[PDB]
Description:
Chain A is mainly alpha-helical.
Amino acid sequence: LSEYAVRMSRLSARLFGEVARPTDSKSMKVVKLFSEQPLAKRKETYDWYPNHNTYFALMGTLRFLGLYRDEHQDFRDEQLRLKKLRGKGKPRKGEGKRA
Amino acid sequence: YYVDWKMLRDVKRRKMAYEYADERLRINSLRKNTILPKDLQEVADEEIASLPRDSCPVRIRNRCVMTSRPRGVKRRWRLSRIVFRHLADHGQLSGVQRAMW
Amino acid sequence: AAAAAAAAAAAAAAAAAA
Amino acid sequence: RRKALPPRTEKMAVDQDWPSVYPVAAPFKPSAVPLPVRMGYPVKRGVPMAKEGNLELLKIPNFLHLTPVAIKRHCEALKDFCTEWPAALDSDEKCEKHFPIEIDTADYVSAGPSIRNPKARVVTLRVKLSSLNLDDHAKKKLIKLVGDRYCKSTDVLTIKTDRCPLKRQNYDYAVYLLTVLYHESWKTEEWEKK
Amino acid sequence: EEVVIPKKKTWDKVAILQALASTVHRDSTAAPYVFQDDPYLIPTSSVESHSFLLAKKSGENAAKFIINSYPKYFQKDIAEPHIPCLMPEYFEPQIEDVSEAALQERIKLNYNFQQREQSEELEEATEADNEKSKTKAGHHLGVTWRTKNNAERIFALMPEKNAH
Amino acid sequence: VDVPKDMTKPEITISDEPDTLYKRLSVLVKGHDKAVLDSYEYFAVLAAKELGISIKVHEPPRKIERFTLLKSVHIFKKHRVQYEMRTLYRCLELEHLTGSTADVYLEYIQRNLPEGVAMEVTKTKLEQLPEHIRKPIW
Amino acid sequence: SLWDIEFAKQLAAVTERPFQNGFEEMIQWTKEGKLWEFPINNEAGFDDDGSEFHEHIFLDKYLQDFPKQGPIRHFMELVTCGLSKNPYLSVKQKVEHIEWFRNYFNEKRVILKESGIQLN
Amino acid sequence: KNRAARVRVSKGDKPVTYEEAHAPHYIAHRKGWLSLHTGNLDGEDHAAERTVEDVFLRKFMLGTFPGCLADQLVLKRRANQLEICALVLRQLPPHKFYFLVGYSETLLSHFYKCPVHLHLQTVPSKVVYKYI
RNA sequence: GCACAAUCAUAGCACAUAAAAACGUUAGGUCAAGGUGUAGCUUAUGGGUUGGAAAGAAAUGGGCUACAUUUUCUACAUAA
Ligand SMILES: [Mg+2]
Ligand SMILES: [Mg+2]
Ligand SMILES: [Mg+2]
Ligand SMILES: [Mg+2]
Ligand SMILES: [Mg+2]
Ligand SMILES: [Mg+2]
Ligand SMILES: [Mg+2]
Ligand SMILES: [Mg+2]
Ligand SMILES: [Mg+2]
């Protein structure tokens, strides 16, 4: 390590746009934090799960409008109808424990 | 609805992390440095602690998209190891085949 | 320690980098 | 009431132009293909399945719109949009003497709703230092200023820019880097005396 | 002096595609491209060909009506170029209190455009010769006594320009 | 017999700007199976021989990604299921191309590019020298 | 003028037709915006506000409201380098980050005076 | 015993298709992929974004064409436009088939912000490959 | 016809490996990948916030380090 070499490196850093003055490795964390995209802002992270609410709402609206025919929902409804006809349904809110 | 209440909470966690990602990104620059004095770093610690809990991306759990299984989920397909097989053996994913060598 | 002065705005105006 | 219409096979002419039936990509509809093709694993006593309702024939991509006849018919009309290549630059020796700078730019394609690919921002600039007007001390300074980006055995400097988002912005940054390096390689400062 | 650099040719986005379309002419034994090539769906007669297009359009406009009735299921944009034609439409005005802002939204989206005129005139608001022209055009495009009632609203209320 | 007449009507103009030159146009086509890649290679060769491109085609090495998962649902680790993803590569090396020629070629290629393959285009844009480097003195 | 649109729709009524060829099916979608622009370039539709490299890399113009010889410049040079090495964010977002740091340091004046280093 | 995508052997009267008649270890050997895209390549991305849209369409078409759909879908993904090939029985009238195809090509395109093509092939019955 | 076999994959054969192994026994494991019939909750066996989910009297399964001289350290492809 020589003075000519350290001046050449200081000029090379200034020209390339890096950190010119000497800094410890611990101070490069704040450099990397802005040089790279944060975790919470990545698309693969913030858009992990699609809109299951939109999926269910669209499917149910189509089913009620008469375009989609959900066999699983029809099975659930048929089983609930048979259960209520047998005599064991869903109690009204507020009369399950007291009444 | 969603798959599970756990997935519903994880969606809100991701949303709050995306909402407060900028504030934490700006505050951590005051803590992860050694040039600025520690007097302001100790205050920045309290400031970032005063943030809501779900704002940090650390509470984000990488679950499945189909069944929301908390473990055994690939990161590239975002699917559980079982739903991935149930789809690959059906052939709805290109290039996937039984490894034979 | 010692710091060398770098012509930033001058180089920018010379190479159309301002 | 069910109606059964015969396919185009009984009406296909033996001298009919095939690109007229299959100009673009099609899902290989068996009603317009007069060729009896059998695809599928046969049975111990059976034969491969027919073309009607064969799922394996729809699974595979079809090149029926890219037969050599259609290839020639399309390439004949494409002679109007292209230009002539200069025959005086067939050998790379004169290409290096005339246009010494090489600009490597990456471009990717993918089927889907998204087009943005973060791998497309990189721009490479390769410059042969034997085609410039650097003096001895200027070259010796440029070597130590660029560092490992200059191959001493190949005598080529490679600048790989990825800091700018846009490819044109990276190209402008690369040409600015080349300009500022060529300018700074000549300035003899005070510290060069030691 | 030894280098040779020719000039480039600028074409349209679909010019080269029309150049390829000019290579292939109309087929003889082929059904029209709007119909499906399957024999069970190929139109047999002229009435069937006239009915299948209407049947397909009755599904197209039905899906468009569903999109217009539920825009929240299509607000999420995935495509990078952000194609606006695949976005849901909105038939409601932006402001309901400002009469000058409601007129400009009701002239472009019959009965509501006429009711906005009364809602604007009830507040003793002076309307210029620019909004009234479009308000009268919105009625002259769609639509006897109401015609005279609106034509008197052109001169008796404000001296609307003869050019309008 | 009934052929349409006057079917040609293009919009081609000659701009005064000098066309850009290219040294090497590399096309890396990745796919799953080899039959589609061979058909695409034949198609590209046929499309290049008509235009006079002199395409050099070699087959880059393949890349196979294998990953192991469990076989059963709840608890069986001694038994596994291994899945494989192959990626076969094709290298189309074009040389001595111009701007308009490269544009029309890439258009005619990407219009008919199959669905099961992807393509990476690497361009060698030719340029002599910028204006501030020819013979400047600071 | 609504009459101009009335004439335009009457022109389109005789102009448009059901597609008779897959080539026309692609031409219409390309003219409308559904199909991509060929050759496929990964930057179609994104201009980044017409900015250049001097608006992204050279960000020293925004650090004038800071002490030059203090540790504030030593801290902000790292942020400037990180923002210049970030092709993901635009120019306005980096300006907003710089302004956030400016107003934070200008609001917290007692801590810098207590630390022992004179800052303005 | 492996059960994944494997239909068991009955007494000898059940009709099975060419797809179900092959065990999962025959993918890319005798039977091909039902979906084609670029996300499942080596140096490519967007593997889950296409997979979720694939499963959504697998369910959507099954709910849209109930009882008349013979086999699984063929989902091609080629240059920003996705093709859906279906083998449907000719149970529904052609007017009802055209209504549904015109509704789908206008709903799914606006729902996924990408052009969709829907091709239908009418079969008289389920094509049986093995014993029936 | 289903198993076996052959064929296929480990980019040339053969070999080996891989892969495959029907019908069934163990009322074998999985209601906690996921949906589920039956039987039970609805001011709670439901939905949220915060804090803790120790520890070892003792036994045991499987791996790593070794108990050295064919060893340990040093530079080093293996003659110190
Ligand atoms: Mg559940
Ligand atoms: Mg065998
Ligand atoms: Mg072999
Ligand atoms: Mg053997
Ligand atoms: Mg085995
Ligand atoms: Mg038991
Ligand atoms: Mg046991
Ligand atoms: Mg339990
Ligand atoms: Mg359950």
